[PDB]
Amino acid sequence: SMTFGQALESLKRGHLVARKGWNGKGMFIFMRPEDSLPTNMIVNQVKSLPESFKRWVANNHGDSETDRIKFTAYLCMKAADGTIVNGWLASQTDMLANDWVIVE
Amino acid sequence: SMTFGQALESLKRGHLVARKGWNGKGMFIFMRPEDSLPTNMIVNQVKSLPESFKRWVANNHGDSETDRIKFTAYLCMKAADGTIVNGWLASQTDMLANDWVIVE
Amino acid sequence: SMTFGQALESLKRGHLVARKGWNGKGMFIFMRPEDSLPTNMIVNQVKSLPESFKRWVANNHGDSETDRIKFTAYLCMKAADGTIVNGWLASQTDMLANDWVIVE
Amino acid sequence: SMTFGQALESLKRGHLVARKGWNGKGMFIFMRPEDSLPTNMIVNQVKSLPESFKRWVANNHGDSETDRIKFTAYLCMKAADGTIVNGWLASQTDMLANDWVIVE
Secondary structure, three states: OEOHHHHHHHHHOOOOEEEOOOOOOOOEEEEEOOEEEEHHHHHHOOOOOOHHHHHHHHHHHOOOOOOEEEEOOEEEEEOOOOOEEEOOOOOHHHHHOOOEEEOO | OEOHHHHHHHHHOOOOEEEHHHHHHOOEEEEEOOEEEEHHHHHHOOOOOOHHHHHHHHHHHOOOOOOEEEEOOEEEEEOOOOOEEEOOOOOHHHHHOOOEEEOO | OEOHHHHHHHHHOOOOEEEOOOOOOOOEEEEEOOEEEEHHHHHHOOOOOOHHHHHHHHHHOOOOOOOEEEEOOEEEEEOOOOOEEEOOOOOHHHHHOOOEEEOO | OEOHHHHHHHHHOOOOEEEHHHHHHOOEEEEEOOEEEEHHHHHHOOOOOOHHHHHHHHHHHOOOOOOEEEEOOEEEEEOOOOOEEEOOOOOHHHHHOOOEEEOO
16 A cells, blocks of 8 residues: 555665556556666667667767766556556656555 | 655645756646536536537536536646646656755 | 547647557547636635645735736546546657547 | 657657757657567566566566567657656647757
8 A cells, every 4th residue: 555655665676566546457667777888889789779869879979988878767667468668657646646566 | 855755745745846956947846636526617617628528528417417527636837937737747767866855 | 540649639629539559448638728817716716726836826926817827738638437637648658659549 | 840749750760859949958859669579588688677577577488488578669868968768758848849850
């Protein structure tokens, strides 16, 4: 019987959490921590990045092998259909509800 | 300072809150509590509702003098420009920050 | 078969829209247009406002009906339980889906 | 001058976009496309996942060399401070604005 604040503190400590009131079933959210990558890795190996973004990184860093780009922490959802949504966002109801529970 | 979870608990108790970086622009958020308005008002007196929604309420309730629509609680922003944005939403960074302050 | 962009242009024209892919059934979203209220009305008549906000309004504005607070347009949801959520949020999946439909 | 709908169609076609007022801070958003990855890579090689989520995956897929988990497309922000936010949020104002522009 947790508020979103308590759910967030559980997420920050690595738990999976959910709301009892969600329409879908089997769903949960989790936090992915901050990460920092060398820019040359961005430009040439990391995918799921659009060519325009890789070009922007290249044009701002070049061949550097010590320049870094930092990715903030963020929330994700294991959705009803089993897919993963990077970038879960909280509805008004989610933020203000007190029906949060720990899944793991 | 405060976590977003502590900010939400302050919001629920009726405070105005903000992240520290908002200070220069004078931005803050607040909670509007649940409210149930008679349907009559909704169909005939509320001006900030589209005609499609007012219809929908009548397709379902007709001339009911007794049926009410419930509006759940939600967050709002008093923006930099002085306008009010109903339906403030939290970014990943906002959700995970710990620089929230009570404004009032 | 509408994108979110098409759905938003319908929302701007006063229609109710929904996603086929949503888990909850019977739901839809709608736009509430910009509204300008006299500050007297905000301070003394609207119940769904916290006292701290009514004081902020009284302290930073006048009392004559020419004194107005502008509420920007925003999106809302008629939820599965019949409640209304002012301040609907678009998920990553909502924003990028092509399964939007006109509801009215 | 683009609606948010037009910005989204541009995003889906690999462009970097922004609202006109973002230009001073040099912020933009981009889309990362869908990707489908084998569960063993998720459990053992993907770097920013919490232990609890890796454990959930292992306890639903074993070592099956073929099982895959799909990550939906999503939006990201190159923020004012140069960090990358996976899972960018559109505000009410953002969704209804018509001051979107192509950055690249």
